[PDB]
């Protein structure tokens, strides 16, 4: 179980790392700094869609 715990904490750091490395060119998709962002997908203004990545 001690050896297994070392594998668990190894994968545990992996889950934390992927939450901080995935960026998409300087952003932070899964860090939680990605608040509600609206994408303007209409000819005029106002008809955007919010996307949230927890």
């Amino acid at each position: 179980r001690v050896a297994i715990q070392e594998e668990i904490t190894a994968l545990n750091d992996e889950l934390n790392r992927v939450a901080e490395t995935t960026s998409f060119g300087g952003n932070k998709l899964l860090n939680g700094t990605f608040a509600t962002k609206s994408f303007q997908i209409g000819a005029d203004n106002g008809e955007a869609v919010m996307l949230n990545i927890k």
Partner: protein
């Protein structure tokens, strides 16, 4: 004869008025064109995908 000469000047004056009109219309086309450009890329920045540097 006075009326005939006055009409000859009149078409000259009126044509001058037309030329001033199209000269303004020449810049009219461009200011509209660049304004359309202003609207296009503001919509490009109206979304949350791009970062602050963009």
């Amino acid at each position: 004869n006075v009326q005939s000469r006055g009409l000859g000047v009149a078409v000259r004056n009126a044509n001058d008025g037309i030329s001033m009109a199209q000269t303004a219309e020449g810049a009219m086309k461009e200011t509209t064109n660049i304004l359309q450009r202003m609207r296009d890329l503001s919509l490009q920045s109206a979304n949350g995908s791009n970062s602050k540097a963009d």
